[PDB]
């Protein structure tokens, strides 16, 4: 599989308002992807997690979603 940082551009990790790029870091559910799937670094993932939670409170990113399978 590919990783998120691998297929992406030069983006702002601290911008909670850019949903289009932050949607890439969420799974099928609203969960935050692990480092193995995002290809981020230690400091990067910690900053991403906080900026994702901000977008959630602004109604921009989902807290949780519904899985369509099984």
């Amino acid at each position: 599989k590919a990783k998120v940082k691998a297929t992406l551009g030069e983006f702002d990790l601290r911008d909670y308002r850019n949903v289009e790029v932050l949607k890439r870091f969420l799974s099928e559910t609203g969960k935050i992807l692990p480092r193995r799937r995002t290809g981020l670094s230690a400091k990067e993932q910690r900053i991403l997690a906080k900026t994702i939670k901000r977008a959630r409170i602004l109604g921009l990113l989902p807290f949780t979603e519904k899985l369509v399978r099984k």
């Binding site: 940082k5 992406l8 983006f11 990790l13 911008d15 909670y16 308002r17 109604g59 990113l61």
Partner: protein
């Protein structure tokens, strides 16, 4: 004075009589708390990720200001008073940390 960022999401059903009033109310609240506004960005109608106040959308505002720090929490209290105002999040400004640079 430090530099902050204000996020306001209000009811996306207002006409221009109510939208101008709610926003000029927001201007009046910034004046009384001494917020020198640096720039503004208005997104407006945006699809929300979950229902907020039974409403699937939200009208988005964003202000970047420079104000005294002690008065921030009272400025947040003054904005949530309005019924049409739904989300008020104020964040201290930060540097645009780049990744995959």
């Amino acid at each position: 004075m430090r530099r902050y960022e204000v996020n306001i999401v209000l009811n996306p059903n207002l006409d221009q009589s109510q939208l101008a009033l709610e926003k000029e109310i927001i201007q009046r609240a910034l004046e009384n708390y001494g917020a020198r506004v640096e720039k503004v960005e208005e997104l407006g109608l945006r699809r929300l990720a979950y229902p907020i106040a039974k409403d699937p959308q939200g009208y988005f505002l964003w202000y970047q200001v420079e104000m005294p720090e002690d008065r921030v929490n009272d400025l947040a209290r003054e904005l949530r008073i309005r019924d049409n105002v739904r989300r008020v999040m104020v964040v201290k400004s930060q540097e645009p940390f780049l990744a995959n640079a």
